[PDB]
CSV table of C-alpha atoms and ligand atoms in Angstrom, one decimal:
chain,number,residue,atom,x,y,z
W,1,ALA,CA,126.5,112.1,45.7
W,2,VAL,CA,124.7,114.5,48.0
W,3,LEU,CA,122.5,117.6,48.0
W,4,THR,CA,124.5,119.9,50.2
W,5,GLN,CA,122.7,122.5,52.3
W,6,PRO,CA,124.0,125.1,54.8
W,7,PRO,CA,124.2,123.6,58.4
W,8,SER,CA,122.2,126.5,59.8
W,9,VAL,CA,120.7,129.9,59.2
W,10,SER,CA,119.3,132.4,61.7
W,11,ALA,CA,117.3,135.6,61.9
W,12,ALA,CA,115.1,137.7,64.1
W,13,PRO,CA,111.3,137.5,63.9
W,14,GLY,CA,109.9,139.4,60.9
W,15,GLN,CA,113.1,139.2,58.8
W,16,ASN,CA,113.6,137.1,55.6
W,17,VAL,CA,115.8,134.0,55.3
W,18,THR,CA,116.9,131.9,52.3
W,19,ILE,CA,118.2,128.3,52.2
W,20,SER,CA,120.3,126.8,49.4
W,21,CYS,CA,120.4,123.3,48.0
W,22,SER,CA,123.3,122.6,45.6
W,23,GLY,CA,123.7,119.4,43.6
W,24,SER,CA,124.2,118.6,39.9
W,25,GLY,CA,123.4,118.2,36.9
W,26,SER,CA,121.9,114.8,36.7
W,27,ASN,CA,119.5,115.6,39.6
W,28,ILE,CA,118.5,119.2,40.3
W,29,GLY,CA,119.8,120.5,36.9
W,30,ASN,CA,117.1,118.4,35.1
W,31,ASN,CA,114.5,117.6,37.8
W,32,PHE,CA,111.9,119.0,40.1
W,33,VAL,CA,112.8,119.8,43.7
W,34,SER,CA,110.7,119.5,46.9
W,35,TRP,CA,111.2,121.0,50.3
W,36,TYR,CA,110.2,119.5,53.7
W,37,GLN,CA,109.9,121.0,57.2
W,38,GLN,CA,110.5,119.1,60.4
W,39,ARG,CA,109.9,120.5,63.8
W,40,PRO,CA,111.7,118.7,66.8
W,41,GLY,CA,109.3,116.1,68.1
W,42,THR,CA,107.1,115.6,65.1
W,43,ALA,CA,107.0,114.1,61.6
W,44,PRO,CA,108.2,116.0,58.5
W,45,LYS,CA,105.8,118.1,56.5
W,46,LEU,CA,105.8,118.9,52.8
W,47,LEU,CA,106.3,122.7,52.2
W,48,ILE,CA,107.2,122.8,48.5
W,49,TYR,CA,106.8,120.4,45.5
W,50,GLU,CA,107.7,120.8,41.8
W,51,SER,CA,110.2,123.5,42.7
W,52,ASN,CA,107.8,126.4,43.5
W,53,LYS,CA,104.3,124.9,44.0
W,54,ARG,CA,102.7,124.9,47.5
W,55,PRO,CA,100.3,122.3,48.8
W,56,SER,CA,97.1,123.6,50.5
W,57,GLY,CA,97.5,124.9,54.0
W,58,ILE,CA,101.1,126.1,53.5
W,59,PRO,CA,101.5,129.9,54.2
W,60,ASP,CA,102.5,132.1,51.2
W,61,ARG,CA,105.6,133.1,53.2
W,62,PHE,CA,107.3,129.9,51.9
W,63,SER,CA,108.5,130.2,48.3
W,64,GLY,CA,110.8,128.1,46.2
W,65,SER,CA,113.1,128.9,43.3
W,66,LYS,CA,115.6,126.9,41.2
W,67,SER,CA,118.6,127.9,39.0
W,68,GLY,CA,121.0,125.5,37.3
W,69,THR,CA,122.3,123.0,39.8
W,70,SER,CA,121.1,124.9,42.9
W,71,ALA,CA,117.6,125.1,44.3
W,72,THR,CA,116.5,127.7,46.9
W,73,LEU,CA,113.8,127.9,49.6
W,74,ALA,CA,112.8,131.3,50.9
W,75,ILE,CA,110.9,132.4,54.1
W,76,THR,CA,109.6,135.9,54.5
W,77,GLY,CA,108.3,137.3,57.8
W,78,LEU,CA,109.9,134.8,60.1
W,79,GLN,CA,107.6,133.6,62.8
W,80,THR,CA,108.6,131.7,65.9
W,81,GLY,CA,106.9,128.5,64.6
W,82,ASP,CA,109.2,128.5,61.6
W,83,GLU,CA,112.1,127.4,63.8
W,84,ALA,CA,112.7,123.9,62.6
W,85,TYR,CA,114.8,121.8,60.3
W,86,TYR,CA,114.4,122.1,56.5
W,87,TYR,CA,115.3,119.5,53.9
W,88,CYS,CA,115.5,119.6,50.1
W,89,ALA,CA,114.7,116.5,48.0
W,90,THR,CA,114.6,115.2,44.4
W,91,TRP,CA,113.4,111.8,43.2
W,92,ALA,CA,116.3,111.6,40.8
W,93,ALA,CA,119.0,111.5,43.5
W,94,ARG,CA,118.3,107.9,44.5
W,95,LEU,CA,120.0,106.4,41.5
W,96,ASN,CA,123.7,105.8,42.5
W,97,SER,CA,124.3,105.4,46.3
W,98,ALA,CA,123.2,109.0,46.3
W,99,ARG,CA,120.8,110.5,48.9
W,100,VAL,CA,117.3,111.7,47.9
W,101,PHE,CA,117.2,114.2,50.8
W,102,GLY,CA,119.5,117.1,51.6
W,103,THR,CA,121.7,117.4,54.6
W,104,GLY,CA,119.9,119.5,55.6
W,105,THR,CA,119.4,122.9,57.4
W,106,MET,CA,118.4,124.3,60.8
W,107,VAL,CA,116.5,127.6,60.9
W,108,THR,CA,116.7,129.6,64.0
W,109,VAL,CA,114.3,132.4,65.0
W,110,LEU,CA,116.5,134.6,67.2
W,111,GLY,CA,115.1,135.3,70.7
W,112,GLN,CA,118.2,135.9,72.7
W,113,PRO,CA,121.8,137.2,72.1
W,114,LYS,CA,124.3,134.9,70.3
W,115,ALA,CA,126.8,133.1,72.4
W,116,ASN,CA,130.0,131.3,71.4
W,117,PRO,CA,130.6,127.8,72.6
W,118,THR,CA,132.8,126.9,75.5
W,119,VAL,CA,134.9,123.9,74.3
W,120,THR,CA,136.6,121.4,76.5
W,121,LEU,CA,138.7,118.5,75.3
W,122,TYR,CA,139.7,115.6,77.5
W,123,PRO,CA,142.2,112.9,76.6
W,124,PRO,CA,141.8,109.3,77.5
W,125,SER,CA,142.2,108.6,81.3
W,126,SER,CA,145.1,106.4,82.4
W,127,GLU,CA,142.4,104.1,83.9
W,128,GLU,CA,140.8,103.6,80.5
W,129,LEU,CA,144.2,102.9,78.9
W,130,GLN,CA,144.9,100.3,81.5
W,131,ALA,CA,141.7,98.7,80.2
W,132,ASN,CA,143.1,98.8,76.6
W,133,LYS,CA,140.7,101.4,75.4
W,134,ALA,CA,141.0,105.1,74.4
W,135,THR,CA,138.1,107.6,74.1
W,136,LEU,CA,138.6,111.3,73.4
W,137,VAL,CA,135.8,113.5,74.8
W,138,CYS,CA,134.9,116.9,73.4
W,139,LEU,CA,132.3,118.9,75.3
W,140,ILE,CA,130.7,122.0,73.9
W,141,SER,CA,128.6,124.2,76.2
W,142,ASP,CA,126.6,127.4,76.5
W,143,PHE,CA,126.2,128.4,72.8
W,144,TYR,CA,123.4,130.0,70.8
W,145,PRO,CA,122.0,129.5,68.2
W,146,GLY,CA,122.0,125.8,68.9
W,147,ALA,CA,124.0,124.6,65.8
W,148,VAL,CA,127.6,123.6,65.7
W,149,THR,CA,129.9,121.6,63.3
W,150,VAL,CA,132.4,119.3,64.9
W,151,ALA,CA,135.4,117.9,63.2
W,152,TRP,CA,138.3,115.8,64.5
W,153,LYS,CA,142.0,115.9,63.5
W,154,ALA,CA,144.9,113.6,64.2
W,155,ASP,CA,147.9,115.9,64.0
W,156,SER,CA,147.5,117.5,60.6
W,157,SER,CA,145.2,114.8,59.3
W,158,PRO,CA,141.4,114.8,59.3
W,159,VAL,CA,139.5,112.0,61.1
W,160,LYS,CA,136.0,110.7,60.5
W,161,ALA,CA,136.0,107.0,61.6
W,162,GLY,CA,135.4,106.3,65.3
W,163,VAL,CA,133.5,109.6,65.7
W,164,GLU,CA,130.1,110.1,67.2
W,165,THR,CA,128.5,113.5,67.9
W,166,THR,CA,125.2,114.4,69.7
W,167,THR,CA,122.6,116.8,68.5
W,168,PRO,CA,122.5,120.1,70.3
W,169,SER,CA,120.3,120.1,73.4
W,170,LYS,CA,118.8,122.9,75.4
W,171,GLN,CA,120.4,123.6,78.7
W,172,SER,CA,118.7,125.2,81.7
W,173,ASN,CA,119.8,128.7,80.8
W,174,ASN,CA,118.1,128.5,77.4
W,175,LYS,CA,121.5,128.0,75.7
W,176,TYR,CA,122.6,124.8,73.9
W,177,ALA,CA,125.1,122.0,74.6
W,178,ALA,CA,126.6,119.2,72.6
W,179,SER,CA,129.4,116.6,72.9
W,180,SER,CA,131.5,114.6,70.4
W,181,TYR,CA,133.4,111.4,71.2
W,182,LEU,CA,136.3,109.9,69.3
W,183,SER,CA,136.8,106.2,70.1
W,184,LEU,CA,140.3,104.9,69.7
W,185,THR,CA,142.9,102.2,70.3
W,186,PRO,CA,145.8,103.1,72.5
W,187,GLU,CA,148.0,102.3,69.5
W,188,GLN,CA,146.2,104.9,67.4
W,189,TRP,CA,146.2,107.2,70.4
W,190,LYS,CA,150.0,106.9,70.8
W,191,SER,CA,150.8,106.8,67.1
W,192,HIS,CA,150.1,110.6,66.6
W,193,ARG,CA,151.7,113.6,68.3
W,194,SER,CA,148.3,115.1,69.1
W,195,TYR,CA,144.6,114.9,68.4
W,196,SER,CA,142.4,118.0,68.0
W,197,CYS,CA,138.7,118.8,68.3
W,198,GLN,CA,137.5,121.6,66.0
W,199,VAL,CA,134.1,123.2,66.7
W,200,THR,CA,132.6,125.6,64.2
W,201,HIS,CA,129.9,128.1,65.1
W,202,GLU,CA,128.9,131.4,63.5
W,203,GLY,CA,131.9,132.3,61.4
W,204,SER,CA,134.3,131.1,64.1
W,205,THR,CA,136.0,127.8,64.8
W,206,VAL,CA,137.7,126.9,68.0
W,207,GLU,CA,140.2,124.0,68.0
W,208,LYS,CA,141.4,122.3,71.2
W,209,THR,CA,144.3,119.9,71.2
W,210,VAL,CA,145.5,117.0,73.4
W,211,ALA,CA,148.6,114.8,73.3
W,212,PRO,CA,149.9,111.5,74.9
W,213,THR,CA,151.7,111.8,78.2
X,1,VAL,CA,94.5,111.4,56.2
X,2,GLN,CA,96.1,108.9,58.7
X,3,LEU,CA,99.2,106.7,58.6
X,4,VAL,CA,99.9,104.4,61.5
X,5,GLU,CA,103.2,102.4,61.7
X,6,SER,CA,103.9,99.3,63.7
X,7,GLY,CA,106.4,96.4,64.0
X,8,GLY,CA,109.4,98.4,65.3
X,9,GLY,CA,111.2,97.0,68.3
X,10,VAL,CA,114.7,96.0,69.5
X,11,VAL,CA,116.3,93.3,67.4
X,12,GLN,CA,119.7,91.6,66.9
X,13,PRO,CA,122.0,91.9,63.9
X,14,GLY,CA,121.6,89.3,61.1
X,15,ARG,CA,118.0,88.6,62.1
X,16,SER,CA,114.8,89.9,60.5
X,17,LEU,CA,111.8,92.1,61.1
X,18,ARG,CA,108.6,93.1,59.3
X,19,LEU,CA,107.2,96.6,59.6
X,20,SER,CA,103.6,97.5,58.8
X,21,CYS,CA,101.9,100.8,58.0
X,22,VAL,CA,98.1,101.0,58.0
X,23,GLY,CA,96.5,103.9,56.2
X,24,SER,CA,93.0,105.5,56.5
X,25,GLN,CA,90.8,108.3,55.4
X,26,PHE,CA,92.0,108.2,51.7
X,27,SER,CA,91.9,105.9,48.7
X,28,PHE,CA,94.9,103.8,49.6
X,29,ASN,CA,94.6,101.9,46.4
X,30,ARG,CA,95.1,105.0,44.2
X,31,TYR,CA,98.4,106.3,45.7
X,32,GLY,CA,101.9,105.0,45.8
X,33,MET,CA,103.7,104.7,49.1
X,34,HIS,CA,107.2,105.1,50.6
X,35,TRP,CA,109.3,104.0,53.5
X,36,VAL,CA,111.7,106.7,54.8
X,37,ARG,CA,114.0,106.4,57.8
X,38,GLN,CA,115.7,108.7,60.2
X,39,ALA,CA,118.5,107.7,62.5
X,40,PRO,CA,118.8,109.7,65.8
X,41,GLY,CA,119.5,112.6,65.7
X,42,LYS,CA,120.3,112.9,62.0
X,43,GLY,CA,118.6,113.6,58.7
X,44,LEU,CA,116.0,111.8,56.6
X,45,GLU,CA,117.0,108.8,54.4
X,46,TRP,CA,114.7,107.4,51.7
X,47,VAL,CA,114.6,103.6,52.0
X,48,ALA,CA,111.9,102.2,49.7
X,49,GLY,CA,109.0,103.1,47.4
X,50,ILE,CA,106.1,101.3,45.7
X,51,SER,CA,103.4,102.3,43.2
X,52,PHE,CA,99.7,102.1,43.8
X,53,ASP,CA,99.2,98.5,42.6
X,54,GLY,CA,102.7,97.3,43.4
X,55,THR,CA,103.9,96.7,39.9
X,56,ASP,CA,106.8,99.2,40.4
X,57,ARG,CA,109.1,98.7,43.4
X,58,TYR,CA,112.0,100.9,44.3
X,59,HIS,CA,114.7,100.3,46.9
X,60,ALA,CA,117.7,102.3,48.0
X,61,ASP,CA,121.1,100.7,47.5
X,62,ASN,CA,121.7,100.7,51.2
X,63,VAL,CA,119.0,98.0,51.5
X,64,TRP,CA,118.9,96.4,48.0
X,65,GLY,CA,118.8,92.7,48.4
X,66,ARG,CA,117.9,92.5,52.1
X,67,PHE,CA,114.8,94.8,52.4
X,68,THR,CA,111.6,94.2,50.4
X,69,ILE,CA,108.7,96.6,50.3
X,70,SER,CA,105.2,95.3,49.5
X,71,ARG,CA,101.5,96.2,50.0
X,72,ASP,CA,98.0,94.7,50.4
X,73,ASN,CA,95.4,97.0,49.0
X,74,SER,CA,92.6,94.6,50.1
X,75,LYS,CA,93.6,95.5,53.6
X,76,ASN,CA,95.0,99.0,53.0
X,77,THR,CA,98.4,98.0,54.4
X,78,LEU,CA,102.0,98.7,53.5
X,79,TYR,CA,104.7,96.3,54.5
X,80,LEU,CA,108.5,96.5,54.8
X,81,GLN,CA,110.2,93.1,55.1
X,82,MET,CA,113.7,93.8,56.5
X,83,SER,CA,116.2,90.9,56.6
X,84,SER,CA,119.9,90.8,57.5
X,85,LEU,CA,119.6,93.9,59.8
X,86,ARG,CA,122.6,95.9,60.7
X,87,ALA,CA,123.5,98.5,63.4
X,88,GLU,CA,123.4,101.0,60.6
X,89,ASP,CA,119.7,100.2,60.0
X,90,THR,CA,118.9,101.5,63.5
X,91,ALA,CA,116.5,104.4,62.9
X,92,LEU,CA,113.0,105.7,63.2
X,93,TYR,CA,111.0,104.4,60.2
X,94,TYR,CA,108.3,106.6,58.7
X,95,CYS,CA,105.5,105.6,56.4
X,96,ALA,CA,105.0,108.3,53.8
X,97,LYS,CA,102.3,108.7,51.1
X,98,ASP,CA,103.2,109.6,47.5
X,99,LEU,CA,101.7,112.8,46.2
X,100,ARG,CA,100.5,111.5,42.8
X,101,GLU,CA,97.0,110.0,42.4
X,102,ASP,CA,97.1,107.0,40.0
X,103,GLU,CA,94.6,104.9,38.1
X,104,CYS,CA,95.3,102.2,35.5
X,105,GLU,CA,95.0,103.5,31.9
X,106,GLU,CA,95.9,100.4,29.8
X,107,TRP,CA,95.8,96.6,30.4
X,108,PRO,CA,99.9,94.1,36.0
X,109,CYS,CA,99.3,97.7,34.7
X,110,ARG,CA,100.8,98.3,31.3
X,111,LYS,CA,100.4,102.1,31.1
X,112,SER,CA,100.5,104.2,34.3
X,113,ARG,CA,101.8,107.6,35.6
X,114,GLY,CA,104.1,106.1,38.2
X,115,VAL,CA,105.3,107.5,41.6
X,116,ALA,CA,106.3,111.2,41.8
X,117,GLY,CA,108.8,110.8,44.6
X,118,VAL,CA,107.1,113.5,46.7
X,119,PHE,CA,106.0,112.7,50.3
X,120,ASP,CA,102.9,114.8,51.2
X,121,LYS,CA,101.8,112.8,54.3
X,122,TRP,CA,103.8,111.1,57.0
X,123,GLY,CA,102.8,109.1,60.1
X,124,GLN,CA,105.0,109.7,63.2
X,125,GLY,CA,106.9,106.4,62.5
X,126,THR,CA,108.1,103.4,64.5
X,127,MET,CA,111.5,102.9,66.1
X,128,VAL,CA,113.8,100.0,64.9
X,129,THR,CA,116.8,99.3,67.1
X,130,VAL,CA,119.6,96.9,66.1
X,131,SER,CA,121.9,95.9,68.9
X,132,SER,CA,123.4,92.6,70.2
X,133,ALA,CA,123.6,94.2,73.6
X,134,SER,CA,121.8,92.8,76.6
X,135,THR,CA,121.3,94.9,79.8
X,136,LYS,CA,124.6,96.0,81.4
X,137,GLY,CA,125.9,98.7,83.7
X,138,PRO,CA,128.3,101.5,82.7
X,139,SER,CA,132.1,101.8,83.2
X,140,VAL,CA,132.9,105.2,84.8
X,141,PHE,CA,136.1,107.0,84.0
X,142,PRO,CA,137.4,110.3,85.4
X,143,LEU,CA,137.9,113.3,83.2
X,144,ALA,CA,140.6,115.0,85.2
X,145,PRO,CA,141.2,118.8,85.2
X,146,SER,CA,144.0,120.4,83.2
X,147,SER,CA,147.4,120.3,84.9
X,148,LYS,CA,147.8,124.0,84.0
X,149,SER,CA,145.1,125.0,86.5
X,150,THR,CA,147.0,125.0,89.7
X,151,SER,CA,146.1,128.2,91.7
X,152,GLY,CA,144.3,131.2,90.4
X,153,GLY,CA,141.2,130.5,88.3
X,154,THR,CA,138.9,127.6,87.5
X,155,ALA,CA,138.9,124.0,86.4
X,156,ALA,CA,136.6,121.6,84.6
X,157,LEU,CA,136.4,118.1,86.0
X,158,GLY,CA,134.0,115.5,84.8
X,159,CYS,CA,133.3,111.8,84.5
X,160,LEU,CA,132.8,109.7,81.4
X,161,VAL,CA,130.0,107.1,81.6
X,162,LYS,CA,130.7,104.5,79.0
X,163,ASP,CA,129.2,101.3,77.5
X,164,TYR,CA,125.8,100.9,79.1
X,165,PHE,CA,122.3,99.8,78.0
X,166,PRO,CA,119.5,100.7,77.8
X,167,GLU,CA,118.7,104.2,78.8
X,168,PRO,CA,118.4,106.1,81.1
X,169,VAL,CA,121.4,107.0,83.2
X,170,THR,CA,121.5,109.8,85.8
X,171,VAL,CA,124.5,111.7,87.2
X,172,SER,CA,124.9,113.8,90.3
X,173,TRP,CA,127.9,115.3,92.1
X,174,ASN,CA,128.9,114.8,95.7
X,175,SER,CA,125.5,113.3,96.5
X,176,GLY,CA,123.7,116.4,95.5
X,177,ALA,CA,125.8,118.9,97.5
X,178,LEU,CA,127.0,120.3,94.1
X,179,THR,CA,124.4,121.2,91.5
X,180,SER,CA,125.7,124.1,89.3
X,181,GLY,CA,129.0,124.5,87.7
X,182,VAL,CA,127.4,121.5,86.1
X,183,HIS,CA,126.5,120.2,82.7
X,184,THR,CA,125.3,116.6,82.0
X,185,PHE,CA,125.1,115.9,78.3
X,186,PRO,CA,122.8,113.6,76.3
X,187,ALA,CA,124.1,110.1,75.4
X,188,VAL,CA,125.5,108.8,72.1
X,189,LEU,CA,124.5,105.6,70.4
X,190,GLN,CA,127.9,103.9,69.8
X,191,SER,CA,128.2,101.4,66.9
X,192,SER,CA,128.2,98.6,69.5
X,193,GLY,CA,124.6,99.4,70.5
X,194,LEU,CA,125.8,100.5,73.9
X,195,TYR,CA,125.4,104.1,75.1
X,196,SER,CA,127.8,106.6,76.5
X,197,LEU,CA,127.6,110.1,78.0
X,198,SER,CA,129.6,112.6,80.0
X,199,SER,CA,129.1,114.9,82.9
X,200,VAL,CA,131.3,117.9,83.7
X,201,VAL,CA,131.4,120.4,86.5
X,202,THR,CA,133.4,123.7,86.6
X,203,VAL,CA,134.9,124.7,90.0
X,204,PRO,CA,137.6,127.0,91.5
X,205,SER,CA,141.1,125.6,91.1
X,206,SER,CA,142.0,126.4,94.7
X,207,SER,CA,139.3,123.9,95.8
X,208,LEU,CA,141.3,121.1,94.0
X,209,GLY,CA,143.4,120.3,97.0
X,210,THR,CA,141.0,120.3,99.8
X,211,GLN,CA,137.5,119.6,98.4
X,212,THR,CA,136.9,116.0,97.1
X,213,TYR,CA,134.8,115.7,94.0
X,214,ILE,CA,132.8,112.6,93.3
X,215,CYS,CA,130.4,111.9,90.5
X,216,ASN,CA,127.4,109.6,91.4
X,217,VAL,CA,126.1,107.7,88.4
X,218,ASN,CA,122.8,105.8,88.7
X,219,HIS,CA,121.8,103.2,86.1
X,220,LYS,CA,118.5,101.7,87.3
X,221,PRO,CA,117.8,99.3,84.3
X,222,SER,CA,120.8,97.2,85.5
X,223,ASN,CA,120.4,98.0,89.2
X,224,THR,CA,123.8,99.6,89.3
X,225,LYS,CA,125.2,102.7,91.0
X,226,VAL,CA,128.8,103.9,90.6
X,227,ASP,CA,130.6,106.6,92.6
X,228,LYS,CA,133.8,107.9,91.0
X,229,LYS,CA,136.3,110.2,92.7
X,230,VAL,CA,137.9,112.6,90.2
X,231,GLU,CA,141.4,113.5,91.3
X,232,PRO,CA,143.8,116.1,89.6
X,233,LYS,CA,146.6,113.5,89.3
X,234,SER,CA,150.1,114.2,87.8
J,301,LIG,ZN1,128.4,126.3,81.7
J,302,LIG,ZN1,150.2,111.9,63.2
């Protein structure tokens, strides 16, 4: 079981944003929810506890609500320091291989125009195949805001095993970059007609495809 | 309120490790405590929890039967005894304080409030790495341009730097004579403990029959350098 959150939300300074946390039932539906903030190179910080109560020192901009199996965090008057990751949590969600924390969500304070990712997908080199290894490489560059969702497919089928993906990183031109690798046996590689890398960013998904020679 | 973690280093699978978190500037004996972990660069994951006196212990199912949380209030110290480590246990381990202030009401403690499951204070954390990998240099493979690039526009050519340890690795192109059509990406932590990254450069397609392109990888921790020529091939 999981507390699913949106991968990302974005807004200009001063605007309002909302973040959802959906579960059940046995967790949210009958239990308190807490929200935590985490800025890049620091430790998490409690923003909300008992659904809507703030600890001391937390701006009144941050508010929490809860309805049915969904909880919600709300930030009014977005400031630049609000750009961070946000996680929802409930102490009930530990009880069956389930995760206490949400997924969670990246909040972006817009400070430049949005940019769609340039996606490049490389098949395994012949040199790597002669070494009895196959690695598919998906490179995603020059996108903003810095949040993407990468998914792999083998022909029409979805893939999750053998996949590793990096967190987005700030390039020199203030835009973001990321990469995803799909590690593979030449048998697996040759067994399908094609493999595809699907990158999702801002209501758009670009899929690139490669096939055995 | 201060939480300081320690004990986190590199370690091999199957073996063991004991993490420690010392707390100060608060009544450590009145609050429950939690161990929470964060693998890079992912989300938070609650590992273990303990009440103020240690009568009530909680462990995630990921670690049930191989991790054990404990505390010594006489020394204001929290302990996480990890055994049978796995590569999946590789993460940054945070010590976190439970929100609820607790005292015993009836006489272990018969009647109590218990932990709340809310983490109001954290402590930067200590890194635990599980890898059976000793120091070794990378294998470099060419990421060749698309065949459908001949004449006209542009082409992305790169090199894949695979299976090395530890960090860091650096990549240049043509000995520094080529510095921007260029992206060098962060590395990934493969399941084998070994690291991998890629570097790509975008150039004109007409230049792919005259100009030679070479990626220069440097991996100092293993005293290795690798120069790889990236050809269009057929
Ligand atoms: Zn670029
Ligand atoms: Zn297939």
